């Protein structure tokens, strides 16, 4: 019972949001309070740090907003194991590091209420099948 006119999807670094783009254009369009979001975003993500954080802004007809903070990218959390330099490229022909099958047994419960899976079973195979596009291994 408050009309939504925008669900804006946006990836932002923890505690380092500013009026500047993407934020300016993304909220200014729908008359959302910009300074207000910057201040609220930053305080919300102050407990994490340097983490990339996906965030959904629900903008209403009165120009109100709420926002939901996400998990963040599976790929960020993978290379929290071996985060050496820049990642791979667009086709996929670059090396970085590696891991094994006991990272998922912690990080798939964190990344759970995103891509919906009630059973613990499939959660393994998605992270193992994400550790490929950057140059990662599982054995």
């Amino acid at each position: 019972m408050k009309k939504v006119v925008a669900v804006v999807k946006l990836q932002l670094p923890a505690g380092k949001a500013t009026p500047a783009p993407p934020v300016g254009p993304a909220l200014g369009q729908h008359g959302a309070n910009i300074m207000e979001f910057v201040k609220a975003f930053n305080a919300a993500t102050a407990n994490m740090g340097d983490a990339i954080v996906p965030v959904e802004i629900t903008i209403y007809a009165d120009r109100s907003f709420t926002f939901v903070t996400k998990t963040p990218p599976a790929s960020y959390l993978i290379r929290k194991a071996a985060g050496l330099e820049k990642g791979a490229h667009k086709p996929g022909r670059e090396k970085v590091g590696r891991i094994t099958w006991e990272q998922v047994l912690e990080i798939a419960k964190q990344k759970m209420p995103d891509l919906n899976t009630t059973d613990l079973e499939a959660a393994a195979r998605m992270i193992a099948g994400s550790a490929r596009s950057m140059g990662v291994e599982v054995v």
Binding site: V8, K9, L10, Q11, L12, P13, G15, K16, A17, T18, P19, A20, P21, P22, V23, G24, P25, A26, G28, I34, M35, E36, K39, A40, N42, A43, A44, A46, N47, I52, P54, P73, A74, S75, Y76, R79, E85, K86, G87, A88, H89, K90, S130, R132, S133, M134
Partner: protein, 250 residues
């Protein structure tokens, strides 16, 4: 500043995304089927998208700007004027101002707690608004910020207000040779307040007080636990919107 447009979505290009924050990007944005990545400097990203210019959304703010009431003050832009009996605080708008709940809560709390002659520490000064407010109330104010870039505007703000706080680069430790203080005011995250609690007790004279804002309703327990743990006693809380102010005596 240059935008970068990508062939997909935030969940179809989910593993090429870390490599973008190695490129220096500040933020990502999803469109009708496009990811727009913004940068302070352009480099050779391998994903073969397309680059665009700088270009609206800065001035919609600056020009709709109404004075912000926070009795006994009103915060005004250099181009406003005021009729009332409020104490005018003139603040060049930009790198933090007067219109946010947290600043208003802290300004009203200064008025309740500050005595003429008190030494004041304004932590994370930004614009210098609270250090300047304190001086208008007869306090002797030091404002510190870990970002030395804000300092010259804090000075310019102070000179348009006819006051002279001291402004320094640093945090608690840099303030220590200027203290101890009667009153500490700090607009900071809950997590920072909670980490700094012991050093807050160190910065204040016996019977001194801390006025703490920047705190989200839901994150206040963190601060309460930390402050009690550091030997402080609760004076009062004040709230507006999502935000609280917490006041303590040592």
């Amino acid at each position: 500043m240059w935008v970068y447009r990508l062939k997909g979505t935030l969940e179809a290009l989910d593993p090429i995304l870390p490599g973008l924050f190695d490129g220096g990007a500040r933020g990502l944005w999803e469109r009708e089927g496009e990811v727009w990545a913004f940068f302070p400097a352009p480099v050779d990203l391998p994903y073969e998208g397309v680059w665009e210019e700088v270009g609206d959304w800065l001035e919609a703010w600056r020009r709709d700007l109404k004075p912000a009431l926070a009795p006994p003050f009103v915060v005004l832009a250099p181009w406003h004027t005021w009729e009332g009996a409020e104490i005018p605080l003139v603040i060049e708008p930009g790198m933090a101002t007067g219109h946010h709940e947290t600043t208003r809560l802290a300004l009203k709390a200064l008025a309740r707690h500050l005595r003429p002659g008190d030494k004041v520490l304004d932590l994370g000064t930004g614009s210098g608004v609270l250090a300047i407010a304190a001086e208008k109330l007869g306090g002797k104010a030091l404002g510190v910020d870990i970002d030395p870039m804000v300092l010259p505007q804090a000075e310019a703000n102070a000179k348009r207000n006819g006051v002279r706080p001291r402004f320094l680069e640093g945090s608690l430790e840099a303030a220590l040779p200027f203290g101890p203080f009667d009153l500490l005011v700090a607009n900071l995250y809950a997590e920072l307040h909670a980490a700094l609690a012991p050093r807050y007790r160190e910065a204040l004279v016996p019977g001194g007080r801390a006025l703490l804002t920047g705190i989200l309703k839901d994150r206040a327990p963190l601060v309460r636990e930390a402050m009690a743990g550091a030997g402080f006693r609760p004076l009062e809380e004040a709230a507006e919107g999502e935000w609280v102010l917490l006041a303590y005596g040592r």
